[PDB]
Tab-separated table of C-alpha atoms in Angstrom:
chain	number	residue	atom	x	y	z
D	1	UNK	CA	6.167	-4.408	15.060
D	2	UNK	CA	7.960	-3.613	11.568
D	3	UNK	CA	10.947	-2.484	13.539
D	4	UNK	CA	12.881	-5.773	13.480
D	5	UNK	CA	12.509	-7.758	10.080
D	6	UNK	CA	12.364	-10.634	12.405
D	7	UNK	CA	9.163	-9.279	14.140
D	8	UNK	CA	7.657	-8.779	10.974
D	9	UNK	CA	8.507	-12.040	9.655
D	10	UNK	CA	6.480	-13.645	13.273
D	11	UNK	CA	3.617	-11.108	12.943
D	12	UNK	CA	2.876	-12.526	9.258
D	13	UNK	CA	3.256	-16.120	10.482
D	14	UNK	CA	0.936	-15.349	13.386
D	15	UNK	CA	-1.527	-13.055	11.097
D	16	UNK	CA	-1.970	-15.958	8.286
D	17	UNK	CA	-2.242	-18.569	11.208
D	18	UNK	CA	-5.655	-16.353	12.300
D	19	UNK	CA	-7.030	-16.315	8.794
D	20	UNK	CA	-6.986	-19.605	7.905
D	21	UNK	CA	-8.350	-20.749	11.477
D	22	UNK	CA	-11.298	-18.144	10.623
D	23	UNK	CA	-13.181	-20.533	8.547
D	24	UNK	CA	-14.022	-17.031	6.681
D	25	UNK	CA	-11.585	-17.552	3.916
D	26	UNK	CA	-10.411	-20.499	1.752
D	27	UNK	CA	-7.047	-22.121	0.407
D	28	UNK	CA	-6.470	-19.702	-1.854
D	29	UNK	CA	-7.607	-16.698	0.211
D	30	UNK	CA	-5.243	-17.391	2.998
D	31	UNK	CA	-2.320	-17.747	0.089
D	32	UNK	CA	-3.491	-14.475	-1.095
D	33	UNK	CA	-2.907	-12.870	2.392
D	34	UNK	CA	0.070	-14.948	2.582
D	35	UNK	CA	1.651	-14.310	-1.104
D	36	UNK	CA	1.155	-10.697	-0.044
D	37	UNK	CA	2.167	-9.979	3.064
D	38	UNK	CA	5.690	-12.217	2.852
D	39	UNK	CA	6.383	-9.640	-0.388
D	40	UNK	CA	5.716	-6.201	1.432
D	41	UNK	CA	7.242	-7.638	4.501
D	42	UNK	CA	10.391	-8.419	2.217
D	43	UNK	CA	10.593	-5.559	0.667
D	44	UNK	CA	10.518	-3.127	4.067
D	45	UNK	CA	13.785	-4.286	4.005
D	46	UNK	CA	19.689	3.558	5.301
D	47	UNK	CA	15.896	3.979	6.591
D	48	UNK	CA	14.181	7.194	6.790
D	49	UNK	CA	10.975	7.895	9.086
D	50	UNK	CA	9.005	8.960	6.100
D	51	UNK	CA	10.241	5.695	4.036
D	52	UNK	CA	8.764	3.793	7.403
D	53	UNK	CA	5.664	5.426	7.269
D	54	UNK	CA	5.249	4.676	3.298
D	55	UNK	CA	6.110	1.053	4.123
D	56	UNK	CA	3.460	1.082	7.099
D	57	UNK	CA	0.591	2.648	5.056
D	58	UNK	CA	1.877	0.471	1.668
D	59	UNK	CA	1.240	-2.754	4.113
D	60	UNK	CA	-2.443	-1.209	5.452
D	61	UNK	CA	-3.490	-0.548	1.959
D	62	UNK	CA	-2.790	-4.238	0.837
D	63	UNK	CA	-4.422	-6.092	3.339
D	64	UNK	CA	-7.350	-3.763	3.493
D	65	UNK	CA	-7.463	-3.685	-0.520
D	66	UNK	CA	-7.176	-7.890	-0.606
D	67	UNK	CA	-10.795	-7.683	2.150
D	68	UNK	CA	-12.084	-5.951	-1.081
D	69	UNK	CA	-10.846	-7.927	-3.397
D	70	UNK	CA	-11.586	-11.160	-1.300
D	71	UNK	CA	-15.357	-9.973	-0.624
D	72	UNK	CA	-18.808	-9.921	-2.256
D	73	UNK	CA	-19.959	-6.156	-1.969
D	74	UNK	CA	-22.952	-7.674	1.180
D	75	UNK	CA	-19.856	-9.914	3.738
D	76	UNK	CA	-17.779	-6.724	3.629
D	77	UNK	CA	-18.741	-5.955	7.129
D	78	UNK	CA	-18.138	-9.327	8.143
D	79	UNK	CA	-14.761	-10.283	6.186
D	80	UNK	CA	-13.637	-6.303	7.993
D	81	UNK	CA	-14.782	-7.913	11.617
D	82	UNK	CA	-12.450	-11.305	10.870
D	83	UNK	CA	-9.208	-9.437	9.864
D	84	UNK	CA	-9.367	-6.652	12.387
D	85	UNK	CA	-9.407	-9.545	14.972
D	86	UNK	CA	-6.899	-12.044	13.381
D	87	UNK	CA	-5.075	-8.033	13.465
D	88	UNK	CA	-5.253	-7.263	16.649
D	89	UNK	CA	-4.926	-11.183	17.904
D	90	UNK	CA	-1.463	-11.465	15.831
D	91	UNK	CA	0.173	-7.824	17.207
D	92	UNK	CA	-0.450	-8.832	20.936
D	93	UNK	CA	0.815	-12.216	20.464
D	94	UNK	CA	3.928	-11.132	18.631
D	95	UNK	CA	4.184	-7.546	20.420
D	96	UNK	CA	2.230	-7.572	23.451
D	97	UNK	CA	0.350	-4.287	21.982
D	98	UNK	CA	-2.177	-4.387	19.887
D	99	UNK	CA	-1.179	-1.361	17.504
D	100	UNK	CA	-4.724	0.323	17.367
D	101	UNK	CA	-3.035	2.786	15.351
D	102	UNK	CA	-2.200	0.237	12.391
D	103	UNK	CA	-6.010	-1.618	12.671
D	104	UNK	CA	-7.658	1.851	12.262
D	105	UNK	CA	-5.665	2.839	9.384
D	106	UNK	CA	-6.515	-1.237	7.652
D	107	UNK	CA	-10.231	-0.150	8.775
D	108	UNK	CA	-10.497	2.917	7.157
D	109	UNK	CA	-8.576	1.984	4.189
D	110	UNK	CA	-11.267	-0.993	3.186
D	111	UNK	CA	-14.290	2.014	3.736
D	112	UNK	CA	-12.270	4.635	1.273
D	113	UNK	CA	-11.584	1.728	-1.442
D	114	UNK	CA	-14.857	0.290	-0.688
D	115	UNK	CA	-15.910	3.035	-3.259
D	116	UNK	CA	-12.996	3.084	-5.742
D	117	UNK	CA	-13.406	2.368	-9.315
D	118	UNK	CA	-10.797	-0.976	-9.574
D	119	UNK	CA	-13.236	-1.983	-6.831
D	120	UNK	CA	-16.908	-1.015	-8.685
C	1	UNK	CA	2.639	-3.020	-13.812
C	2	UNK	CA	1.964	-6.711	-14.299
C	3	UNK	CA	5.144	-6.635	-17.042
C	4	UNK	CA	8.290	-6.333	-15.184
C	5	UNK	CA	9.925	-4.577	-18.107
C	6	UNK	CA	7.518	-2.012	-18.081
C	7	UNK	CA	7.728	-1.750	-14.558
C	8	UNK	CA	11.646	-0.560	-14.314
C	9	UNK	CA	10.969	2.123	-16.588
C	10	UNK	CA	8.192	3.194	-15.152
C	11	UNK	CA	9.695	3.709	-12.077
C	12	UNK	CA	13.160	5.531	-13.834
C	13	UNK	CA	10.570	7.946	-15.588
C	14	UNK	CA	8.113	9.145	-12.690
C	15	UNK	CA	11.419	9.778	-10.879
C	16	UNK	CA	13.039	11.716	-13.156
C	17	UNK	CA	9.898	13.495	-13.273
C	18	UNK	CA	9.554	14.130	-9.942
C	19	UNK	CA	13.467	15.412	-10.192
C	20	UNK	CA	12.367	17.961	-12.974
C	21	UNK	CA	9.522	19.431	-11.488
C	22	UNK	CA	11.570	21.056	-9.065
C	23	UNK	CA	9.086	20.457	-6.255
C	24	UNK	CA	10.501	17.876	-4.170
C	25	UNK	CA	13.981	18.052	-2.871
C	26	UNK	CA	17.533	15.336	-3.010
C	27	UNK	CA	15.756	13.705	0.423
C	28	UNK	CA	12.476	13.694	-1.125
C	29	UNK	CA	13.263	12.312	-4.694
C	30	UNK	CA	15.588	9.773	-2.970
C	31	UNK	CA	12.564	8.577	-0.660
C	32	UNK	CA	10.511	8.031	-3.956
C	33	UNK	CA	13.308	6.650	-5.411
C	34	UNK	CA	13.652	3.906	-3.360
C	35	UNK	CA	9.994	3.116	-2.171
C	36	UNK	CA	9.180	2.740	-5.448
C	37	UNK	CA	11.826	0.217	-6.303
C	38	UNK	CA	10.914	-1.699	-3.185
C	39	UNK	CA	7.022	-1.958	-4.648
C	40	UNK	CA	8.344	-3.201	-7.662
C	41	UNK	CA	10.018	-5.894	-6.202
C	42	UNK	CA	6.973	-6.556	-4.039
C	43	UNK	CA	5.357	-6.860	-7.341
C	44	UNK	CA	6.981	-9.381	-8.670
C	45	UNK	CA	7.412	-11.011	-5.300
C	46	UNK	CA	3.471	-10.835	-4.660
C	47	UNK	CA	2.866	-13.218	-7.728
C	48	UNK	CA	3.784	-16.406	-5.953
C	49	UNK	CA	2.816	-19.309	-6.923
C	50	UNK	CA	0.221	-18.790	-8.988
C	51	UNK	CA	-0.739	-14.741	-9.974
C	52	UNK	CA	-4.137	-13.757	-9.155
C	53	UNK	CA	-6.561	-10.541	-9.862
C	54	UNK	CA	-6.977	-10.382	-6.145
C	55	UNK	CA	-3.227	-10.156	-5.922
C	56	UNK	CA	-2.719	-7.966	-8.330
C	57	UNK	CA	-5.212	-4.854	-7.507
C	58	UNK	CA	-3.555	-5.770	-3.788
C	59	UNK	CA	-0.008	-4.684	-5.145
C	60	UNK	CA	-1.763	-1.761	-7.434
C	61	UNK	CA	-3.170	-0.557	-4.199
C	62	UNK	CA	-0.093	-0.720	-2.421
C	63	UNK	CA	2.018	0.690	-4.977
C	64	UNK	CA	-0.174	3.712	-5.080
C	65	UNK	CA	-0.505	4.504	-1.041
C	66	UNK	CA	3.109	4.155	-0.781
C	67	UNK	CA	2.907	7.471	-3.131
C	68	UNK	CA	0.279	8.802	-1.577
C	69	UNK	CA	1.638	8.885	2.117
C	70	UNK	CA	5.578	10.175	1.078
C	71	UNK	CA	3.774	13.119	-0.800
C	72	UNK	CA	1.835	13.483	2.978
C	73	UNK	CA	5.422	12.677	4.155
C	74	UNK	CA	7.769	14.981	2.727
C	75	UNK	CA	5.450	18.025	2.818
C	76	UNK	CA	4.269	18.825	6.355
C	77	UNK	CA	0.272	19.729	5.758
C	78	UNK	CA	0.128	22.646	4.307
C	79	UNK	CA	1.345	23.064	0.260
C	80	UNK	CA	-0.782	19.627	-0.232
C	81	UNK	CA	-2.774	20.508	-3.373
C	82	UNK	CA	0.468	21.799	-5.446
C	83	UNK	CA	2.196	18.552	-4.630
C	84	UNK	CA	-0.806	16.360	-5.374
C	85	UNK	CA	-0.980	18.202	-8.646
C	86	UNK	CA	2.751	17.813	-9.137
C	87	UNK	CA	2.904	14.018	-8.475
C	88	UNK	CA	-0.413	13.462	-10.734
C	89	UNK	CA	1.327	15.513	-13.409
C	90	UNK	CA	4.815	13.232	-13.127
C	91	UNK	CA	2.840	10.104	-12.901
C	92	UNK	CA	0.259	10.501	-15.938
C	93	UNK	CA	3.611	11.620	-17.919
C	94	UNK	CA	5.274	8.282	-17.012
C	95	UNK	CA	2.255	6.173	-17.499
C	96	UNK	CA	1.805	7.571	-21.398
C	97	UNK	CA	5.641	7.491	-22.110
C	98	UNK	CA	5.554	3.736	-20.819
C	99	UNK	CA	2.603	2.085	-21.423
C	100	UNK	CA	0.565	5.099	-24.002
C	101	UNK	CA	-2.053	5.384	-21.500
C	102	UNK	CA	-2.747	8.222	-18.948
C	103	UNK	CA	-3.629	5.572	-16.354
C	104	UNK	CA	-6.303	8.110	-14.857
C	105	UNK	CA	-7.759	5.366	-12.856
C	106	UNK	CA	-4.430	4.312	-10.794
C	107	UNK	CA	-3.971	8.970	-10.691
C	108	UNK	CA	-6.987	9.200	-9.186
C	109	UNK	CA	-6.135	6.500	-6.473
C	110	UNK	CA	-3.493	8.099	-5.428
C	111	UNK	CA	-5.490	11.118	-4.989
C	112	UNK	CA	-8.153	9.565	-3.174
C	113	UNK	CA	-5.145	8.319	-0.811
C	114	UNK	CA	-3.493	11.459	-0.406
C	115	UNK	CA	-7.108	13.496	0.884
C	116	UNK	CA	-7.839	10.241	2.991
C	117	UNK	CA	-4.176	9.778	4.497
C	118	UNK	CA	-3.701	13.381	4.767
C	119	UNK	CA	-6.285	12.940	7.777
C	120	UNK	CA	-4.511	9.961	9.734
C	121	UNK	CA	-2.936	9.462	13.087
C	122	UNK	CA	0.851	8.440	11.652
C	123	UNK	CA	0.448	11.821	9.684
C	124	UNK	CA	0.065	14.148	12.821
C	125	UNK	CA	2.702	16.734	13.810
């Protein structure tokens, strides 16, 4: 989905649309998700594969690091449940694939910085 | 990473370190090159309307896995530890020079990100 920068720019629309229709998060959770998805999206803009992987995993790492950030230690589980399905909801709506790939990678990121200390 | 000025030079040092320590090659210094200017425009970018602490550990994170994942990148598996202690080496020298801190905290991130990438899908050959 982060092949065309139109794609991407549909995908975000789409992804922020599922978060605030959650009920999980508030205004300025949503804008958080918003603020930083526009920005990486932006910036993924000659290419290189490995550059396109960075990009990929630099995306992952935000979104899973704002469910941190955006969480109480004890709704962790919960606030992981609500973006991996306004994930997977926003990929097959804007790609017709769901990109399992990507939503393991988010899922796995938020367990590994679930113990880092800028998280403790 | 919050001050833009800061930022820039920053990113000019850990490059230039990277370029000195002989480790990476012209591909592989280029790649860091411009990933990292991207995440400091993200950065700034990220702030929006109104800067948060949310926001801003979101862009840390990112700034640091975006390391992380061209060290994984530009290697192919197996000389992993000598890079890691390469980059970690390039990055606590840029931190001091720019801010007089070692940073250890946002090192050891990208540490953590390099064992737990290191073991993902996109990473496969």
């Amino acid at each position: 989905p982060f092949s065309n920068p139109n794609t991407a720019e549909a995908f975000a629309r789409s992804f922020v649309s599922n978060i605030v229709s959650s009920g999980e998060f508030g205004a300025q959770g949503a804008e958080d998700f918003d603020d930083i998805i526009q920005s990486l999206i932006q910036a993924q803009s000659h290419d290189t594969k490995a550059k396109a992987k960075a990009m990929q995993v630099a995306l992952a790492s935000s979104i899973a690091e704002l469910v941190i950030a955006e969480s109480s230690g004890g709704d962790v589980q919960r606030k992981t449940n609500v973006i991996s399905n306004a994930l997977r909801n926003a990929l097959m709506s804007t790609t017709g694939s769901p990109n399992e790939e990507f939503v393991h990678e988010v899922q796995d990121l938020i367990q590994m910085l679930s113990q880092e200390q800028i998280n403790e």
